[PDB]
Amino acid sequence: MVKTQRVVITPGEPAGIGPDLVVQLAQREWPVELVVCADATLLTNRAAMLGLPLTLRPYSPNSPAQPQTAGTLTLLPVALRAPVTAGQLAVENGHYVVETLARACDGCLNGEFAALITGPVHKGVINDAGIPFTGHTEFFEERSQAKKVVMMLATEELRVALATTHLPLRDIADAITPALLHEVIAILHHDLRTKFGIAEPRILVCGLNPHAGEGGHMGTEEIDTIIPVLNELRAQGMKLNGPLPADTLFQPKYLDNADAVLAMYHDQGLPVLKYQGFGRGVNITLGLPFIRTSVDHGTALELAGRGKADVGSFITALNLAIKMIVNTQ
Amino acid sequence: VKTQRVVITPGEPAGIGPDLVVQLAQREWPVELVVCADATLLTNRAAMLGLPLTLRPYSPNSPAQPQTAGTLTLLPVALRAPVTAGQLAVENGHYVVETLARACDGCLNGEFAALITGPVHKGVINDAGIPFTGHTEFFEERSQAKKVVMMLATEELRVALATTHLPLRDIADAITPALLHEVIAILHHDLRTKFGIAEPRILVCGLNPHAGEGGHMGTEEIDTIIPVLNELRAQGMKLNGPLPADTLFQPKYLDNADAVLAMYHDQGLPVLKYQGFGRGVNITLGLPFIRTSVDHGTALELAGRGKADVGSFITALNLAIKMIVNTQ
Ligand SMILES: [Zn+2]
Ligand SMILES: [Zn+2]
């Protein structure tokens, strides 16, 4: 037989919509135990504000996991630094947020949890707390000591991975080196196989310049670097199509035959993806020893505690992580 | 009110332009279709395609008449050499340029209400020894336009670009306050005068991801884009601040805007094309007159085949007609 799996969930910024969404997630049944790494009173209070029921059971590593039943959550306690008011940032709680991220990450690394699903966090308040922080991705990449991770955004079957992420537009070109493409594609191909269960992944690659450089008249990176690397990889047996113009690549004739698209940078790949799934969009981090998914939106402070939060993205992030667990177990 | 005339240039004679125009002709139109080309070229390409075609002479002294199915109105310009579909003939470069000049002058003089252009081949024109820096450039110069802004639109979305075909590494330094002021002024101006929108609402993309996230991801938004937009909003222009490109393309935004200004090519066209694709139409903003254009090349390998696909030519023409209707 199999064992009930546990997934760890970090609601994120206490004053944002993360806690609201996690209380909303809890209103249905799940085939895994949902271990929520947060402050008990925070969830209890927020649930009351939303008029939703919630009973918390303690994370108990020395007992078998049990599927999470509606109206409940399993809690791995982490104390808040200061009292919370929905919508208002409290600098000291920045340490609390990171503490939950660290504990959740470690549990995934120690094998306590089969996946990690993150709610939104406010980077500002974390830095104000004196903790350098540029996002979950960099945080997990570093704490997990992974050589490199790749960010991916996905809806149903349409998946876009990024060669570069949150960098100024002007720093992108010089970052596209043979070393980067080799690592990024290796990780993408690897995880599509190990985490997505795709035996022979087919990757669609964007050029860096409009028209993919149009034969060198619009940039030389495709001819100088991208093409040589892709062919080096195709000789290794990888199935790659491209580089292709970004404004041409997102078509059925190309997408129907690809398991993922690799964009050279953030705004080249995400706009199409987002305009294809308001909610439903899921941020996935590839290259880590464990499965990590996440909502694809912000903390929406102005909505915290008011009852009008869209749980669509968190639900899909959770569903996806659960489905990926099998491919690894 | 009164029937308007639009002028159409099929373009490179050996290309698919004539093919598309002959197909365009197979239906009725609410405007008179004045095609600036060689009569023989059109009748021959018609025969090759098995489509019927009757040409009536452009008669400026008579009232314009809506174009009837199976016909086109002709503004004659003679080929310099015989045409073979699919083969470029340098001598006909002079013919191509003459049709562009005549059509352009007609739009500047009030003879025609809009110009819809078929595909042209720059290489053959240049190889004939003819100074010519490009299709839209030709019109920009002949019309004495100071600056043009390229836009791609369908019916539910209009995307203008601050920069077009530049290597990605050249974009950042190209986004200057002067370029931005210029581009937005034209965009705001034309949404008024060419699309007939009284109080245009424009969504503006940041240059950097997350619109630079308070300077944590680039400084262009704080150093350049935000100041320019602030200045223009002070002029009543409805500009929705630099928004992250990956959140901007959404109803709470789009349904509230008449156009989106993207900073560069791959930031705005992928979504436009995904939301439409063949539905796309290129509109040149900044000229003294309305000009729309097909979105494909001369496709010489398809010329005279029968698999043309006048689809995009129809969308470009329909779009120009609507613009004429909403501005008269
Ligand atoms: Zn991002
Ligand atoms: Zn282009």
UniProtKB/Swiss-Prot annotation, chain B:
It comes from the Bacteria. Its EC number is 1.1.1.262. Signal peptide: none annotated. A divalent metal cation binds at residues 165, 210, 265. It catalyses: 4-(phosphooxy)-L-threonine + NAD(+) = 3-amino-2-oxopropyl phosphate + CO2 + NADH. InterPro entries: PdxA, PdxA_fam. Binds 1 divalent metal cation per subunit. Can use ions such as Zn(2+), Mg(2+) or Co(2+). Its cofactor is Zn(2+); Mg(2+); Co(2+). Pathway: Cofactor biosynthesis; pyridoxine 5'-phosphate biosynthesis; pyridoxine 5'-phosphate from D-erythrose 4-phosphate: step 4/5. Keywords: Cobalt, Cytoplasm, Magnesium, Metal-binding, NAD, NADP, Oxidoreductase, Pyridoxine biosynthesis, Zinc. It is an enzyme of class 1 (oxidoreductase). It is found in: Cytoplasm. One of its GO terms (biological process) is pyridoxal phosphate biosynthetic process. The active site is located at the dimer interface. Belongs to the PdxA family. HAMAP family: PdxA (MF_00536). This is 4-hydroxythreonine-4-phosphate dehydrogenase. It comes from Escherichia coli (strain K12). The gene is pdxA.
